[PDB]
Amino acid sequence: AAQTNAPWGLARISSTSPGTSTYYYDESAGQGSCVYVIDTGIEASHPEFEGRAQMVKTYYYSSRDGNGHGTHCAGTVGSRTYGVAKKTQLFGVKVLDDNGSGQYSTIIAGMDFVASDKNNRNCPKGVVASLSLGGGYSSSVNSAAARLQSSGVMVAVAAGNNNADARNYSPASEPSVCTVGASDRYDRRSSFSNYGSVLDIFGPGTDILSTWIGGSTRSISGTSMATPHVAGLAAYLMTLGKTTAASACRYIADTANKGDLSNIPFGTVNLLAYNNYQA
């Protein structure tokens, strides 16, 4: 399948070179997989989700996304127009408030929740969790991410936007999950992206168009935007049977575009997520 005039990030993950505008992908499109977006929530009623999104848990007064961040990230995973895996099932877990903040205890609870909840859902091709959030180092937060991964969920987390070594941030610094940095449309490391030996992979993160609240769209930037590209790619690859939750991060790194990025500090991987689609 091909989507013409796609958002640049979708085109980038299906090409070996920058500058293209068509997103090429297998029609299976992640059908049969499930992705939990752990964030400010998801505006499930947005037409772009086609009834494939559902809120399953909130830690606040409402399950509504009053911020937009979660809806944007969810759109990059699996909306019709802006998504990588256009037929996946999305589940929203609201661990961040409408200002985009949240306590570590709540974020941990949300991870533990997904590890259990996935056992109540029909996701025959596998389960992914996308965490576009983080803060200063916490061994407890790292442990929660490690448990989630251990339970059989492909965990993708943002590296962070401090232009610093991600070793000092969580859950970015947990080695067992897939830690995602951001790149721009000219194949440079995004100016705000964290880096360091704990990164596993880069994905598009600057000027990413996706869904927003009130049935709208907008372009924003961050490692928060790169993370759902990788999460969606994992769901997509799982549905194709190329990899499993335990090994998807490694498979994505193995099959990545290598050496294409500029402004990567020595010691950080130069690997850009790539779907290897051949018609």
């Binding site: 959030l133 803060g135 401090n162 930037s221």
Partner: peptide
């Protein structure tokens, strides 16, 4: 510029 870590 954050949309985060």
């Amino acid at each position: 510029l954050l949309f985060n870590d």
